C-alpha cells in the first residue's frame, strides 16, 4: 500500500505517525488526512503531566482517552507522551521540590501508566532532562534538584508499572553527534544499560531549523545509540521550511538503521503546527500534499533507481519527446510555456528546488494562474506561492500543490508549440515527464 | 528627505500614498507606519457610494471625514474614491435605472464633491467602466444602461461640482498596452479630450498578479495616455508576492513619465491588504519593511549611481576589501559565512532574488539563525523565511528583514576568516558592502 506514509513505512517494518490534537478531531479535513496517512499516534498535549494529574493525587484521562480512542478505532498504535518532565507541570507540581517532588514524580508515573497499562507501544518516560548550555550536563529543574538519580528512578518505576511498554528517553538537539548534549544522553543510556537500568529506546525529537540544523552525521548518532542495545525513534519530526531533501535525508537515515522503529512528524497540517510560522510539516493549510510529502513517500518506497538532475536539467515528456520550453526564451511574466525539441538553452533548463519550485533563469517560477482544468502554465517571478510549487510523482507526473492537477500538454498535442496547461491527472504520456 | 517613501517621492514632485481604513486608525502600529511613510491618502471604502449616501438624498460623511481629517492633519493630500461605480452601490441605487438613476448619479456626485469641494486633490469620478471579456467595450451595468454618455455626464457634473479637483477615470487591467480593455479606455479618453469632455487624469489601479502580470509596456501605456494631455496616476498598486524588481519597475515607470503624479499602494501592511494571501504590500504584518520597500525607496531616490549586478555576483566588504565567502565552498546547512580574498568561485557568487534572498549554489540562502546581535549569518536551504530575506540599502549596508539588523564583520575584522554576524546597523565600514 505504498501510496500512504504509514503503509509505505510498513514495507520496511516501520511505522509513520503524527501528533494528534484532540481539539481538532472534529475537523473532518484534519481526521481524513490523519487517519489515511499514519499508523502511529502521539497525543500532542493530552497525556502530559498537567493534563493527566490536574491536582495532586487526582488523575484525569478524558483528554488523553479521546486521542487514544480515536487512534485505536482507526488502527493506530500509540506512543505515550510524556511521564516525567520539567515543562508543562501543573501548578501544584511546580511548587514541589526534594523528596516530596520525587514521590509525586513516582506517584504520577504509576497513575498514568496504570490507566494505560498494556495499551501503549512506547512511553516517553523522561523528557528533555539535559541542558542546552553546551556542556552536555543535566538541565537544572526541580526534578534534577531531587537528585541525579531521578531519571533512573523514573525508568525503574515505569518498568514495574507496565512491563509491556517500551521505555524511551526523549529529547531534542541530540541528533548532531558533535553536540555535547547528544554525547551526554549517550553516556547516560550507556550507563543505564551497563547497570541494568530499564530503558528500551531513545527518542530523537528531530525539531530541525536553521538554529539547530539537520546534519548527515545523524545516521551515525542513530547507529551509536542502536549499538548500545536500545531502539531509536524519530518522535517529533518537523523541519523549518520543510526542505524536500532534508525530509528525505532524515527518512533514509532511519531506514538505514535496523533499530529505528519509525518516524513521527509533530503535526498533520502546517496550520496545526506548534510552529506554523516555520511551515515545517508535510501538509499545508488546505490539506494538500507538499513537495516534501512526495520526497518522504518516495524515500520510504526505496527512492528512485537513478539520481535526479543535480542543478539544472530538462523536463522531457514521454508522449512527445520534447522538452518543457519557454517560448522564445522569453523572461516576461505571464508567458505560457510550451513543448519543443530539446537542446542546450537556459529557457529549457528547469531546476527543482527543495521548496518544490521549477525555476528557470534562476528567479522565474513555473506558475499556474488558476486551479481548474485548462489553466495555462506560465512563468512568473518566484514568490513561494502554492501555485508555484509542484510534486514529482514516482509515476513521472508533475502535480500542482495548490491545484492538485497535472502538467498537461493541450489536446495531447506532441508537435512543437504545444502549450502546457493544468488538467485532471491521468496516466497519459502527455502528463509524464523524464528528468535529464 | 529620502528615508521615507513619501519624502523620496516628493524629491521629484511626486507623492507616495496608501489606502487608509478608518477602523485601523486606532491601531498605533498602523498609524505609526502610515503617517511616517505616505504623503497621500485614499479612503479604502469610506468615500464610496454606499458609505456616503446610505439613502438617496441623505449623506453620511462621518467615516469619510475621519480619514480625510487624519490625512490633512498628518500632512497628506487626498484622492477621492469614488463617485460613480457599478460596485458597492447602496441597496436603493442597485435597483434604480434609466433616467432616475442618471439623476441619482448626478445628485450623488454633487453631494459628495460639494461636501469635499476644494479639499480633494484627485477624484476617481468613474471607476471600472470597461469589461474584461476582451471586446474592449463598456461593462454592462445599471449605469451603462442609462446611456453610453453616462461617463461623459459624470465628468461634466464633477467639473461643475469642484473645478479645483483633478478628475480621473480609474480602472484595472488597463496597464498592459496590448489589451483591448486598455485600448478601449485609451480611445474613450482620446475622444473625450478632442470633444472637450472635462477629464484631467487616468488612474491605473495596477493590481498585478499571475492572472494579470506586470509588463514593461506599462510605461508605454502611461506615456501614451500622458501624450493625450492627461495626467496619470498609479492608484491601487499591489504586487502578488511583492517582487522587488516589479515594485522597482513600476516605480521607475512613473519616474520616467513627467505626467505621472505619484504612486499609491493599496494598503499599509500585508495583513491589512484586501488580498493578504498574496502578501502584495511593502510592510509585513509585524510592521517590518519588506525587501520591496527598499527597492522602491532606492528607486525613488534615483537608484544606485552604478547599475546593480544581475544575479550571481560578489559581495565585498568596504572596510576589508574582502568578499562574502562560504568556507571551503561547503554546502552544509548551518555553515557560517566569512570574509575572504575575492576570487571567481561559486562559494562567492551571490544572487539577490525578487523575494529578497541572497542565494548561493542555486538553492542555498543567506540565513540568520536568530534576531539578536551576534546571531550567526550562515547558509541554509531556501524556503522563503524572513530570516532569509534582506534589504539592500543605498548606503551599502545589508539589513535582515526579520531582525532589522545589518550584516556585520565580527569585531570589525578585515582578515580572511573573519566571521559574519547580525548587529545593530552602525554605518561602520564592516557593515558596508559593494555588489559587483
Ligand atoms: O519546548 C521545547 C523548546 O523550548 C525547544 O527549543 C529548542 C531550543 O534550542 C534551539 O536550538 C538552539 C539554537 O541556538 C543554539 O545556540 C542553541 O544551543 C540551540 O539549543 C532549538 O532549535 C529549539 O527547538 O525545542 C523542543 C521543545 O519541546
Ligand atoms: O498554552 C499551552 C501551549 O503553549 C502548549 O503548547 C504545546 C507545547 O508543547 C508542544 O509539544 C512539544 C514540542 O517540543 C517537544 O520537544 C516536546 O516534547 C513536545 O511536548 C505542543 O505541540 C504545543 O501545543 O499546549 C498547552 C497550552 O495550554
Ligand atoms: O464586506 C465588504 C468588503 O467586501 C469590502 O471590501 C473592499 C472592496 O473594495 C476594495 O477596494 C477596491 C479594490 O479594487 C479596486 O478596483 C477598487 O477601485 C477598490 O475600491 C477594498 O480594499 C476592500 O476593503 O469592504 C466593505 C465591506 O463591507
Ligand atoms: O481546450 C482543450 C483542452 O481542454 C483539452 O484538454 C484535454 C482533455 O482531455 C485530456 O485527456 C487531455 O490530456 C487534455 O489535453 O485538449 C484540447 C484543447 O483544445
Ligand atoms: O473587484 C475587482 C476585482 O474583481 C478585479 O479582479 C481582477 C480580474 O481580472 C484578473 O485578471 C485580475 O488579476 C483580478 O485582480 O480586480 C479589481 C477589483 O476592483
Ligand atoms: O563587529 C561588531 C561591531 O560592528 C559593533 O559595532 C558597534 C555597533 O553599534 C554601535 O552603536 C557601537 O558604537 C559600535 O561599536 O560592535 C560589536 C562588534 O562585534
Ligand atoms: O522557445 C523556442 C526556442 O527554444 C527554440 O529554439 O526556437 C523556437 C522557440 O519557440
Ligand atoms: O572558502 C575559502 C575559499 O574560497 C578559498 O579559496 O580558500 C579558503 C577557504 O576558506
PDB file of C-alpha atoms in Angstrom, chain B residues 48-196:
ATOM      1  CA  UNK B  48     -17.617  55.104  -1.864  1.00  0.00           C
ATOM      2  CA  UNK B  49     -21.265  55.493  -2.904  1.00  0.00           C
ATOM      3  CA  UNK B  50     -22.897  53.201  -0.343  1.00  0.00           C
ATOM      4  CA  UNK B  51     -20.861  54.667   2.521  1.00  0.00           C
ATOM      5  CA  UNK B  52     -21.597  58.300   1.711  1.00  0.00           C
ATOM      6  CA  UNK B  53     -25.247  58.012   0.670  1.00  0.00           C
ATOM      7  CA  UNK B  54     -26.924  55.097   2.544  1.00  0.00           C
ATOM      8  CA  UNK B  55     -30.250  56.533   1.409  1.00  0.00           C
ATOM      9  CA  UNK B  56     -30.972  58.783  -1.571  1.00  0.00           C
ATOM     10  CA  UNK B  57     -30.725  62.418  -0.548  1.00  0.00           C
ATOM     11  CA  UNK B  58     -29.237  61.681   2.875  1.00  0.00           C
ATOM     12  CA  UNK B  59     -25.457  61.926   3.028  1.00  0.00           C
ATOM     13  CA  UNK B  60     -23.272  60.469   5.775  1.00  0.00           C
ATOM     14  CA  UNK B  61     -19.715  61.837   5.648  1.00  0.00           C
ATOM     15  CA  UNK B  62     -18.708  60.713   9.142  1.00  0.00           C
ATOM     16  CA  UNK B  63     -16.363  57.873   8.199  1.00  0.00           C
ATOM     17  CA  UNK B  64     -15.120  59.805   5.182  1.00  0.00           C
ATOM     18  CA  UNK B  65     -14.146  62.964   7.059  1.00  0.00           C
ATOM     19  CA  UNK B  66     -12.485  60.766   9.682  1.00  0.00           C
ATOM     20  CA  UNK B  67      -9.995  59.615   7.034  1.00  0.00           C
ATOM     21  CA  UNK B  68      -9.788  62.980   5.290  1.00  0.00           C
ATOM     22  CA  UNK B  69      -9.053  64.775   8.579  1.00  0.00           C
ATOM     23  CA  UNK B  70      -6.429  62.263   9.678  1.00  0.00           C
ATOM     24  CA  UNK B  71      -4.770  62.725   6.288  1.00  0.00           C
ATOM     25  CA  UNK B  72      -4.680  66.539   6.320  1.00  0.00           C
ATOM     26  CA  UNK B  73      -3.642  66.784   9.987  1.00  0.00           C
ATOM     27  CA  UNK B  74      -0.773  64.452   9.120  1.00  0.00           C
ATOM     28  CA  UNK B  75       0.395  66.282   6.020  1.00  0.00           C
ATOM     29  CA  UNK B  76      -1.184  64.163   3.288  1.00  0.00           C
ATOM     30  CA  UNK B  77      -3.247  65.140   0.263  1.00  0.00           C
ATOM     31  CA  UNK B  78      -6.329  63.067  -0.501  1.00  0.00           C
ATOM     32  CA  UNK B  79      -7.658  61.124  -3.503  1.00  0.00           C
ATOM     33  CA  UNK B  80     -11.455  60.867  -3.501  1.00  0.00           C
ATOM     34  CA  UNK B  81     -12.584  57.302  -4.240  1.00  0.00           C
ATOM     35  CA  UNK B  82     -15.026  57.020  -5.895  1.00  0.00           C
ATOM     36  CA  UNK B  83     -18.073  58.897  -7.347  1.00  0.00           C
ATOM     37  CA  UNK B  84     -19.736  56.661  -9.980  1.00  0.00           C
ATOM     38  CA  UNK B  85     -19.218  52.900  -9.999  1.00  0.00           C
ATOM     39  CA  UNK B  86     -21.203  49.693 -10.528  1.00  0.00           C
ATOM     40  CA  UNK B  87     -19.866  48.195  -7.296  1.00  0.00           C
ATOM     41  CA  UNK B  88     -20.561  48.957  -3.663  1.00  0.00           C
ATOM     42  CA  UNK B  89     -23.661  50.981  -4.535  1.00  0.00           C
ATOM     43  CA  UNK B  90     -26.211  51.179  -1.725  1.00  0.00           C
ATOM     44  CA  UNK B  91     -29.295  48.977  -1.956  1.00  0.00           C
ATOM     45  CA  UNK B  92     -31.553  51.759  -3.216  1.00  0.00           C
ATOM     46  CA  UNK B  93     -29.223  52.569  -6.103  1.00  0.00           C
ATOM     47  CA  UNK B  94     -28.663  48.972  -7.195  1.00  0.00           C
ATOM     48  CA  UNK B  95     -32.326  48.962  -8.188  1.00  0.00           C
ATOM     49  CA  UNK B  96     -32.557  52.316  -9.958  1.00  0.00           C
ATOM     50  CA  UNK B  97     -32.441  52.501 -13.754  1.00  0.00           C
ATOM     51  CA  UNK B  98     -32.670  54.819 -16.735  1.00  0.00           C
ATOM     52  CA  UNK B  99     -33.391  58.483 -16.058  1.00  0.00           C
ATOM     53  CA  UNK B 100     -33.937  58.263 -12.294  1.00  0.00           C
ATOM     54  CA  UNK B 101     -30.557  56.535 -11.932  1.00  0.00           C
ATOM     55  CA  UNK B 102     -28.833  59.073 -14.183  1.00  0.00           C
ATOM     56  CA  UNK B 103     -30.248  61.779 -11.936  1.00  0.00           C
ATOM     57  CA  UNK B 104     -29.182  59.797  -8.873  1.00  0.00           C
ATOM     58  CA  UNK B 105     -25.607  59.622 -10.190  1.00  0.00           C
ATOM     59  CA  UNK B 106     -25.574  63.361 -10.743  1.00  0.00           C
ATOM     60  CA  UNK B 107     -27.011  64.228  -7.336  1.00  0.00           C
ATOM     61  CA  UNK B 108     -24.530  61.897  -5.628  1.00  0.00           C
ATOM     62  CA  UNK B 109     -21.572  63.450  -7.456  1.00  0.00           C
ATOM     63  CA  UNK B 110     -22.872  66.869  -6.437  1.00  0.00           C
ATOM     64  CA  UNK B 111     -23.410  65.963  -2.803  1.00  0.00           C
ATOM     65  CA  UNK B 112     -20.027  64.366  -2.139  1.00  0.00           C
ATOM     66  CA  UNK B 113     -17.866  66.771  -4.137  1.00  0.00           C
ATOM     67  CA  UNK B 114     -19.913  69.577  -2.663  1.00  0.00           C
ATOM     68  CA  UNK B 115     -19.042  68.429   0.852  1.00  0.00           C
ATOM     69  CA  UNK B 116     -15.358  67.983  -0.067  1.00  0.00           C
ATOM     70  CA  UNK B 117     -15.237  70.912  -2.527  1.00  0.00           C
ATOM     71  CA  UNK B 118     -11.698  72.251  -2.756  1.00  0.00           C
ATOM     72  CA  UNK B 119     -10.320  69.661  -0.330  1.00  0.00           C
ATOM     73  CA  UNK B 120      -9.650  66.820  -2.795  1.00  0.00           C
ATOM     74  CA  UNK B 121      -6.522  66.568  -4.963  1.00  0.00           C
ATOM     75  CA  UNK B 122      -7.889  63.891  -7.284  1.00  0.00           C
ATOM     76  CA  UNK B 123     -11.337  62.325  -7.608  1.00  0.00           C
ATOM     77  CA  UNK B 124     -11.910  58.939  -9.219  1.00  0.00           C
ATOM     78  CA  UNK B 125     -15.163  60.144 -10.774  1.00  0.00           C
ATOM     79  CA  UNK B 126     -15.816  56.969 -12.757  1.00  0.00           C
ATOM     80  CA  UNK B 127     -14.468  53.557 -11.778  1.00  0.00           C
ATOM     81  CA  UNK B 128     -14.132  50.333 -13.817  1.00  0.00           C
ATOM     82  CA  UNK B 129     -16.499  51.063 -16.730  1.00  0.00           C
ATOM     83  CA  UNK B 130     -14.957  48.565 -19.177  1.00  0.00           C
ATOM     84  CA  UNK B 131     -15.409  44.790 -19.229  1.00  0.00           C
ATOM     85  CA  UNK B 132     -12.793  42.052 -19.092  1.00  0.00           C
ATOM     86  CA  UNK B 133     -14.384  39.928 -21.830  1.00  0.00           C
ATOM     87  CA  UNK B 134     -11.807  41.052 -24.383  1.00  0.00           C
ATOM     88  CA  UNK B 135     -14.094  43.100 -26.614  1.00  0.00           C
ATOM     89  CA  UNK B 136     -12.677  46.370 -25.340  1.00  0.00           C
ATOM     90  CA  UNK B 137     -16.190  47.634 -24.740  1.00  0.00           C
ATOM     91  CA  UNK B 138     -18.128  49.057 -21.798  1.00  0.00           C
ATOM     92  CA  UNK B 139     -19.211  46.855 -18.904  1.00  0.00           C
ATOM     93  CA  UNK B 140     -22.928  46.099 -18.780  1.00  0.00           C
ATOM     94  CA  UNK B 141     -24.176  47.818 -15.637  1.00  0.00           C
ATOM     95  CA  UNK B 142     -27.295  49.623 -14.484  1.00  0.00           C
ATOM     96  CA  UNK B 143     -25.160  52.742 -15.001  1.00  0.00           C
ATOM     97  CA  UNK B 144     -24.256  51.875 -18.599  1.00  0.00           C
ATOM     98  CA  UNK B 145     -27.878  51.048 -19.480  1.00  0.00           C
ATOM     99  CA  UNK B 146     -28.724  54.661 -18.661  1.00  0.00           C
ATOM    100  CA  UNK B 147     -26.838  55.760 -21.756  1.00  0.00           C
ATOM    101  CA  UNK B 148     -23.310  55.330 -23.108  1.00  0.00           C
ATOM    102  CA  UNK B 149     -22.893  59.018 -22.294  1.00  0.00           C
ATOM    103  CA  UNK B 150     -23.095  58.457 -18.543  1.00  0.00           C
ATOM    104  CA  UNK B 151     -19.320  58.651 -18.181  1.00  0.00           C
ATOM    105  CA  UNK B 152     -19.268  61.991 -20.005  1.00  0.00           C
ATOM    106  CA  UNK B 153     -22.077  63.351 -17.814  1.00  0.00           C
ATOM    107  CA  UNK B 154     -20.318  62.277 -14.616  1.00  0.00           C
ATOM    108  CA  UNK B 155     -17.202  64.220 -15.614  1.00  0.00           C
ATOM    109  CA  UNK B 156     -19.092  67.311 -16.724  1.00  0.00           C
ATOM    110  CA  UNK B 157     -21.059  67.154 -13.474  1.00  0.00           C
ATOM    111  CA  UNK B 158     -17.846  66.754 -11.478  1.00  0.00           C
ATOM    112  CA  UNK B 159     -16.029  69.658 -13.104  1.00  0.00           C
ATOM    113  CA  UNK B 160     -19.063  71.721 -12.161  1.00  0.00           C
ATOM    114  CA  UNK B 161     -19.153  70.493  -8.554  1.00  0.00           C
ATOM    115  CA  UNK B 162     -15.462  71.226  -7.934  1.00  0.00           C
ATOM    116  CA  UNK B 163     -13.203  72.713 -10.664  1.00  0.00           C
ATOM    117  CA  UNK B 164     -10.147  72.685  -8.377  1.00  0.00           C
ATOM    118  CA  UNK B 165     -10.129  68.890  -8.315  1.00  0.00           C
ATOM    119  CA  UNK B 166      -8.369  66.753 -10.897  1.00  0.00           C
ATOM    120  CA  UNK B 167     -10.952  64.392 -12.357  1.00  0.00           C
ATOM    121  CA  UNK B 168      -9.783  60.834 -13.006  1.00  0.00           C
ATOM    122  CA  UNK B 169     -11.156  57.786 -14.773  1.00  0.00           C
ATOM    123  CA  UNK B 170      -9.996  54.782 -12.714  1.00  0.00           C
ATOM    124  CA  UNK B 171      -9.821  51.121 -13.766  1.00  0.00           C
ATOM    125  CA  UNK B 172      -7.856  47.849 -13.542  1.00  0.00           C
ATOM    126  CA  UNK B 173      -6.374  45.570 -16.215  1.00  0.00           C
ATOM    127  CA  UNK B 174      -5.651  48.674 -18.301  1.00  0.00           C
ATOM    128  CA  UNK B 175      -1.901  48.521 -17.623  1.00  0.00           C
ATOM    129  CA  UNK B 176      -0.853  46.221 -20.479  1.00  0.00           C
ATOM    130  CA  UNK B 177      -0.879  48.213 -23.715  1.00  0.00           C
ATOM    131  CA  UNK B 178      -1.725  45.162 -25.821  1.00  0.00           C
ATOM    132  CA  UNK B 179      -5.025  44.539 -24.009  1.00  0.00           C
ATOM    133  CA  UNK B 180      -8.301  45.511 -25.674  1.00  0.00           C
ATOM    134  CA  UNK B 181      -9.589  46.962 -22.420  1.00  0.00           C
ATOM    135  CA  UNK B 182      -6.583  49.285 -22.300  1.00  0.00           C
ATOM    136  CA  UNK B 183      -7.313  50.433 -25.853  1.00  0.00           C
ATOM    137  CA  UNK B 184     -10.987  50.807 -25.065  1.00  0.00           C
ATOM    138  CA  UNK B 185     -10.108  53.261 -22.308  1.00  0.00           C
ATOM    139  CA  UNK B 186      -7.443  54.908 -24.449  1.00  0.00           C
ATOM    140  CA  UNK B 187      -9.895  55.670 -27.254  1.00  0.00           C
ATOM    141  CA  UNK B 188     -12.516  56.996 -24.858  1.00  0.00           C
ATOM    142  CA  UNK B 189     -10.058  59.412 -23.253  1.00  0.00           C
ATOM    143  CA  UNK B 190      -8.686  60.417 -26.646  1.00  0.00           C
ATOM    144  CA  UNK B 191     -12.246  61.114 -27.782  1.00  0.00           C
ATOM    145  CA  UNK B 192     -13.031  62.990 -24.561  1.00  0.00           C
ATOM    146  CA  UNK B 193     -10.008  65.249 -24.922  1.00  0.00           C
ATOM    147  CA  UNK B 194     -10.877  66.021 -28.550  1.00  0.00           C
ATOM    148  CA  UNK B 195     -14.558  66.807 -27.940  1.00  0.00           C
ATOM    149  CA  UNK B 196     -13.550  68.705 -24.815  1.00  0.00           C
TER     150      UNK B 196
END
